[PDB]
Design a protein around this ligand. Structure first.
Ligand SMILES: O=C(O)C[C@H]1CN(c2ncnc3[nH]c4cc(F)ccc4c23)CC2(CCC2)O1
Length: 167
């Protein structure tokens, strides 16, 4: 038993809700919240900008130190940093950005990072400003992640569409 509430069960291990991931994190304080990161951990907009704003820019300050030490992430890769006031840990995962020409096949590699964590609160990778089809992203998630994932979808119209079209 865990503290996530109001989710629709899609499979044995994947759950979905129309919710703002920032507010969901603030209330649940999950062990892991996933950020929709870029390789530079520049949290300017989308999910990343919203999560970073909720930490009063502490996420960005920590991320800048991480990059100064380690260099950029790989597309499809991840790193674990602090969850600040939102979660114990933040798993920063880089899905491909279709608006940068990145290979959509890397989306499966990105979701594989979730399997290192027993339970996660997450967005749909490569959705939103990353330009991928969120329905495809949901399919890859369900076919790749084996751990327990609670997906927060901000947009209500898209949520309804994701549910109604789910096979
Ligand atoms: O509607 C979606 O869920 C898909 C979109 C948006 N996203 C989010 N997912 C959950 N919570 C959110 N809160 C936000 C607050 C913002 F200011 C901006 C965006 C989000 C957001 C995920 C993405 C992929 C990156 C962008 O695509």
């Amino acid at each position: 038993v865990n503290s996530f509430s109001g989710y629709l069960k899609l499979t044995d291990n994947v759950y979905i809700k129309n919710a703002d991931i920032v507010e969901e994190a603030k209330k649940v304080k999950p062990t892991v919240v996933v950020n929709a990161a870029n390789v530079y951990l520049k949290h300017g907009g989308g999910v990343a900008g919203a999560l970073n704003k909720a930490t009063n820019n502490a996420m960005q300050v920590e991320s800048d130190d991480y990059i100064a030490t380690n260099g950029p992430l790989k597309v499809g890769g991840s790193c674990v940093l602090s969850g600040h006031n939102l979660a114990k840990h933040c798993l920063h995962v880089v899905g491909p950005n279709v608006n940068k020409g990145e290979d959509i096949q890397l989306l499966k590699s990105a979701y594989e990072n979730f399997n290192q964590h027993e339970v996660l609160l997450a967005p749909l990778l490569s959705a939103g400003i990353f330009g991928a089809d969120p329905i495809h992203s949901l399919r890859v998630c369900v076919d790749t992640v084996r751990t327990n994932v609670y997906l927060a979808v901000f947009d209500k119209n898209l949520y309804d569409k994701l549910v109604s079209s789910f096979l």
